[PDB]
Amino acid sequence: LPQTVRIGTATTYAPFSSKDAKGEFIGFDIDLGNEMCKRMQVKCTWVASDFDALIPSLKAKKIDAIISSLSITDKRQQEIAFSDKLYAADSRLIAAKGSPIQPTLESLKGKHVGVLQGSTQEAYANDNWRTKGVDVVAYANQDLIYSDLTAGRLDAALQDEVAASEGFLKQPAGKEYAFAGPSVKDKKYFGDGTGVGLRKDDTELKAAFDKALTELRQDGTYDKMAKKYFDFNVYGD
Ligand SMILES: N[C@@H](Cc1c[nH]c[nH+]1)C(=O)O
Questions:
Q1: Which residues form the Solute-binding protein family 3/N-terminal domain (predicted)?
Q2: Domain 90-190: CATH superfamily, name plus number
């Protein structure tokens, strides 16, 4: 293992990764990463990036790990390796309170839908919606999506369910918005929860992460950390 492990993350996805008022990194990803590093007995430097630059930066060795709500998908496994699951992550639509919008082509054709560049939601939205007449608009960071929704530039926005819920819907800025329909289920696109993204050849680093995460889950540190953010089981199955 390196003495310093460099972890990239996109700090605009509360409550998993964001910045406090002084610019320090906060969220459940941060806590998980810092707790794993503690147990791996390495130093960890967090590195902020747009989400869609994370996997390119990992391939170029500018970072060594990604902890950024990075969903474990089949396509991504072709390019990088993953730790064991850190938590589950369903996708879901948000729109203005009272809107009839559903995550269907029939409901969304002609409306403007925000998605994060590089995400599984952009992959899904591009294939099923954008080609068929939905104005799918891709954003560099998720904060910009929420803002464009509250200004009425967007009709709806597709992102991880818990990020939307805890990072926006339950905040003042999303008081007048809600989920539009239930979770969009599509195991192909959205993957099997999130994990630490790693280079394929870094078997020893993956092993160290996987073992730290088992240890912090076994002794109950996971749940203590998660209760700061969630009143439900974020881990899943
Ligand atoms: N979990 C999804 C959505 C996401 C946006 N930012 C971080 N994650 C993905 O890995 O693409």
A1: 4-233
A2: Periplasmic binding protein-like II (3.40.190.10)
Alpha-carbon span 65 to 15, nearest angstrom: 19
Q: Which CATH class is domain 1-89+191-237?
A: alpha beta
Domain ranges across the chain: 1-89+191-237, 90-190
The coordinates were experimentally obtained by: X-ray
**Residue 112 contacts residue 155 (beta carbons within 8 Å):** yes
Q: Which residue has the tokens 């559903």?
A: 102
The resolution, in Å, is 2.3
Written as six digits, the tokens of 65 are: 């790990």
Please count the other Cβ atoms lying within 10 Å of the Cβ belonging to residue 213.
Answer: 23
Q: Count the Cβ atoms, other than its own, within 10 Å of residue 208.
A: 20
> What residues line ligand 1, using a CB cutoff of 6 Å?
10, 13, 51, 68-71, 89, 116, 119-121, 160, 194
Coil, strand or helix: which one is 158? Answer: strand
Tell me how far apart the alpha carbons of residues 227 and 81 are, in angstroms, rounded to a whole number.
Answer: 28
Choosing from 70, 79, 124, 196 the residue with most ligand 1 atoms within 8 A of its CB, the one to mutate for a pocket test is 70
